[PDB]
């Protein structure tokens, strides 16, 4: 196409999962991760592991 040269530059990106984005399950269930609770919130097991 009459171009003396065509040069391509490919850049990268990483994206952070944040409130509202889309997830689901292999047991067939749609949903959105929508609540960003500070780690002092999510309930913890009897052994303490949340």
């Amino acid at each position: 196409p009459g171009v003396l040269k065509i040069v391509k530059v490919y850049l990268a990106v990483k994206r952070r999962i944040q409130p509202g984005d889309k997830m689901a399950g292999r047991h067939g269930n749609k949903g959105v991760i929508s609540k960003i609770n500070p780690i002092e919130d999510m309930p913890y097991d009897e052994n303490g592991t949340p």
Partner: protein, 229 residues
Amino acid sequence: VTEFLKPRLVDIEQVSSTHAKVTLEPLERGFGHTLGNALRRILLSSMPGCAVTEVEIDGVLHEYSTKEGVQEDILEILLNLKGLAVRVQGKDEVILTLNKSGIGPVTAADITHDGDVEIVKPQHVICHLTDENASISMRIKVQRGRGYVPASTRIHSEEDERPIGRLLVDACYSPVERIAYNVEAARVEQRTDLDKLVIEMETNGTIDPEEAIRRAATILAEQLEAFVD
């Protein structure tokens, strides 16, 4: 008060260097629940620590690229080395270093030993080598933070700085990582049946159990100080 019987630190057992189960003195009714809950919350809340904050390594220019002689990716290097944790002295924002070659597995021990830091375990991973001729060269900068500082949360700090070769990654900056409460009632015969609360604390080993508990208590007291007014 009427003989409120305030609890105090006692019978602290260290299950491991980073696993501990500590006790306290018995306390009056109604505080043990509040004491244990507030303790777990505050302790997990703000445990200041030191961690790797920015990386400047001679070899790679783009961490999403490979490296001959090295096995793991540069992103894999960042991930595994992000497992670097070390006790830090009063000095902060230090630059530790690690450079070596060979054909054996690469361990955290092969790092430049400075006078203000201490590596807890020689067992961490530094992307074990693959070829004799290759030589890894890196210097890891450590900062002292209270919690997770996002990668772009540190972006605005560099206007004309951060050349291609010096990059930033994410962290946790909180050596606490475990604080839990279990209230029982024992060792109370002379007075009414009081309650003693056992605290299960599994820190990163960077902060001592009693020292961390004391710091958290001081924070809580400072908070409650305004509450009177």
